[PDB]
């Protein structure tokens, strides 16, 4: 019957690894690099667009950086289509929590649930896992500014600074070298761009090949603003740090 054509996507190797999870991670390693850096007074998200074309509409484009609610954003690395399925789920989970408790969802709770959905696809159903790694940048009134990552395994961990996708090995060494705990957002912006500038497979890092976002308390008195940078705003911050 149909048993003949079943890939068995949810089985262990003799070494005790999940084939499809390992191969999904291999897929993600070829995706454009995404960096998250957490400062004392905000979080930076920086992502590299996958080999841009000159005739691609840059200003009205969203590939890497998505908004989950007013306090939480994600940077994507992997299949964009897969990511959008999970993002819409996360956006609904956040509104369900707000509807139930009349409080914005704590960052970890949203991350755990999205991570638990990925886990399910590795343990049952016989379907391929989601070929997606997320960097979650968020704020809540409990833990303040928080960075997390999740991967197709459904495992998630917290970070002061982290990279996903291409050249993470190289990127993580550079972040580990220059990062310190009493860092400001403006300093973290400079670190994120300098790191992408050195790890990129492109000849030179330009505004048209970048997505950028900050989560600051820059708005008046104890409130968080999400700034998804425009093309012209990336062009300016790229000149100001002296990369172009």
């Amino acid at each position: 019957g149909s048993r003949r054509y079943d890939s068995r996507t949810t089985i262990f190797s003799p070494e005790g690894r999940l084939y499809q999870v390992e191969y999904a991670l291999e897929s993600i390693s070829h995706a454009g690099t995404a960096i998250g850096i957490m400062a004392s007074d905000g979080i930076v998200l920086a992502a590299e667009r996958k080999v841009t074309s000159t005739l691609l509409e840059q200003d009205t484009s969203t590939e890497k950086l998505y908004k989950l609610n007013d306090k939480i954003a994600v940077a994507v690395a992997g299949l964009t289509a897969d990511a959008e399925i999970l993002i819409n789920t996360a956006r609904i989970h956040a509104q369900n929590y707000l509807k139930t408790y009349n409080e914005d969802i704590p960052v970890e709770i949203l991350v755990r649930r999205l991570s638990d959905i990925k886990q399910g696809y590795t343990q049952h159903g016989g379907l391929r896992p989601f070929g997606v790694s997320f960097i979650y940048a968020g704020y809540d009134d409990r833990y303040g500014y928080q960075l997390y990552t999740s991967n197709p395994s459904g495992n998630y961990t917290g970070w002061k600074a982290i990279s996903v996708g291409a050249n993470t090995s190289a990127a993580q060494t550079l972040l580990q070298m220059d990062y310190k705990d009493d860092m400001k957002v403006d300093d973290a912006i400079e670190l994120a761009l300098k790191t992408l500038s050195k790890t990129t497979d492109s000849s030179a890092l330009t505004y048209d090949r970048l997505e950028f976002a900050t989560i600051r308390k820059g708005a008046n008195d104890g409130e968080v603003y999400q700034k998804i940078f425009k093309p012209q705003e990336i062009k300016d911050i790229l000149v100001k740090t002296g990369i172009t």
Partner: protein
């Protein structure tokens, strides 16, 4: 045992010159017993204002529901919902519960951010749209409000004048209804500023 008149309360909306006004009483009761004098019936999703009269549990539930739906709208559309579109969403959501309806009389008020056109609308409990140039009324003193509005209202009132007209329309209607009153709130809505005034009224 008539759900629409257990908790009581009223909403009225009016159009002026380049402005709208929406107002409500603050009473929540259990029939004869007054329970709360701080129960606001007007909510806003961006620049779109929604008043809801009727069964208070459904007023709270629909507020929580339209916050949910407009939050998701904004994330996907990357812009705040407009009054005309929100009206259609209220209509859709009410008629979805056609044979198990929310016992409510919702009122939409706001200015279209693009055209600058003042907009008001009212609905029955299953979501039939009443679109009106002049005014919309809802609640246990709807008859009283219709009488006040139909006589007091004139077109193209300035914000400061429209305030007096809607305030007097509500106060005098609430004073002739047992299940309405215990304080009142009036929102004056201009294109890019919104003033909220609490009215002094008799507490009986």
């Amino acid at each position: 045992s008539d759900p629409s008149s257990i908790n009581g309360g009223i909403v009225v909306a009016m159009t002026g010159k380049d402005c709208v006004a929406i107002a409500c009483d603050l009473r929540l009761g259990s029939q004869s017993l007054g329970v709360s004098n701080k129960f606001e019936k007007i909510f806003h999703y961006g620049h779109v204002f929604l008043g809801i009269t009727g069964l208070a549990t459904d007023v709270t539930t629909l507020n929580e529901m339209f916050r949910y739906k407009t939050n998701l709208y904004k994330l996907k559309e990357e812009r705040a919902i407009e009054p005309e579109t929100f009206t259609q969403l209220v209509s859709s959501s009410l008629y979805e519960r056609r044979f198990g309806p929310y016992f409510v009389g919702p009122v939409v008020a706001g200015i279209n951010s693009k055209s600058g056109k003042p907009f008001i609308a009212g609905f029955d409990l299953i979501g039939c749209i009443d679109e009106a140039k002049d005014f919309i009324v809802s609640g246990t003193a709807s008859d009283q409000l219709f009488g006040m509005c139909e006589s007091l209202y004139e077109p193209n009132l300035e914000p400061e004048d429209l305030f007096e007209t809607i305030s007097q329309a509500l106060l005098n209607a609430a004073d002739r209804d047992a299940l309405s009153g215990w304080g009142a709130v009036v929102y004056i809505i201009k294109k890019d500023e919104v003033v909220k005034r609490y009215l002094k009224m008799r507490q009986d």
